[PDB]
Amino acid sequence: LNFYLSYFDDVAKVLPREHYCFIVGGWVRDRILGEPVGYNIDVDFLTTADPVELAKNFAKRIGGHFFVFEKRGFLIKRPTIASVVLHLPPYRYRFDFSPLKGKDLEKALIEDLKERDFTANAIAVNLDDVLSIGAKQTIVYDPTGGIKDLEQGLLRPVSIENLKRDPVRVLRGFRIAIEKNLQLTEDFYEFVKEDPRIVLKSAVERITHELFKIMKEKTAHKVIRELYEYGVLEAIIPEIGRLREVKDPLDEHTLKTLEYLEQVIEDRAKYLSAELLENFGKKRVLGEFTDVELLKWGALFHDIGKPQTFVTFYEHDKVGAQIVREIGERLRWGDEATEFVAKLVRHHLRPFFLREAFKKGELKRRGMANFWRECGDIAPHLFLLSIADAMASGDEEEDIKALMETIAELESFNRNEMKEEXXXXXXXXXXXXXXXXXXXXXXXXXXXXXXXXXX
């Protein structure tokens, strides 16, 4: 009843008569927790069938085109997982399929469950048991006793060795703990305390994926703070640790910048214009993530250049862009993604300048047009980041209002004031280049002043 999903039926139709499937990990966990199903559904499976064929035909039934990547060999037993990803804008589906092999089915299932990272993820149920019609409580498999830990609200790794085998999970342990609101056990925290840099063992792609999963949630700032306190964030991103040596506290300012940024993004309807809000957050990166996570990375990286420069900081913020680019290359971020974050960091101080020009009444069509021309793409993100950084810097409420009103002045100037009205009038790319220069003069006796300014 609780464990039911519609597509499971399709699985049962694809699943061979002599082969079985088991619902494992996150889905059963969240289902026991009694959490309402979100817009993202991820279900892990353990099957005795061929995962490739099973997931391929399931993918033929529901769409969600077939995904199989792993190496095959005589041994060591090399896992092959086949996933189905069905993506429509409001809802995303991911079904994982993993091989289950052995002479004793139950012993093999238990054996596989004991290898998993945490007790909450070690709970597995049988597919045929979920589809079972009545007169029984569907049997659950938790040799690690995940249910008991979930009842006590504790997130306990099965064994520390499992964490040392796959270090990236040490990130999950934090994230889930904040995401499902669970308290991690003592042995975990102690293990992280002993050797924080262990996370560097696992592949970089999975690290990036996990960190993006962290940046996805609205509680992200807490998890980031937790990763920074244990030195994990410094191990993954050495540049963040360098924010430590420059004293005004820059690191606290950055964490608070993120924490405030989340609240601002929640309030984004207030400050931002509707035309900006329409296309905001709808830009996909890495196939499961949006530009919002890039905005949060833009909050963490908002000043990464202040430690590099030293009385005042001047040219760093551009340097911030370069550093962000380097990290993006090292962390295997998407090209357009790391370019977006870099561009977001580069201009991070721009709305403050326009604000200062607004408070003095110096802000005019020239500065606005220059702004929107230079960056119109990162404009909303830059606005939210500017407001957040204004909240984190302890700016006066009047000054913050000046920033918001400056932002909305830019937006109002763009949505309505800015209109191109041509080549036939100028003659009354040599003509196109002079048309762009005359356009900048209109965005900042009339015809003669434009013809003279062009030559």
Swiss-Prot record:
Its EC number is 2.7.7.-. Changing R332A: Does not affect CMP incorporation. Signal peptide: none annotated. Keywords: Magnesium, Metal-binding, Nucleotide-binding, Nucleotidyltransferase, RNA-binding, Transferase, tRNA processing, tRNA-binding. GO terms for molecular function: CC tRNA cytidylyltransferase activity; CCACCA tRNA nucleotidyltransferase activity; metal ion binding; nucleotide binding; tRNA binding. Changing H348A: Does not affect CMP incorporation. Changing F67A: Does not affect CMP incorporation. It catalyses: a tRNA precursor + 2 CTP = a tRNA with a 3' CC end + 2 diphosphate. Its cofactor is Mg(2+). Adopts a seahorse-like shape and consists of four domains: head, neck, body, and tail. Belongs to the tRNA nucleotidyltransferase/poly(A) polymerase family. This is CC-adding tRNA nucleotidyltransferase. It comes from Aquifex aeolicus (strain VF5).
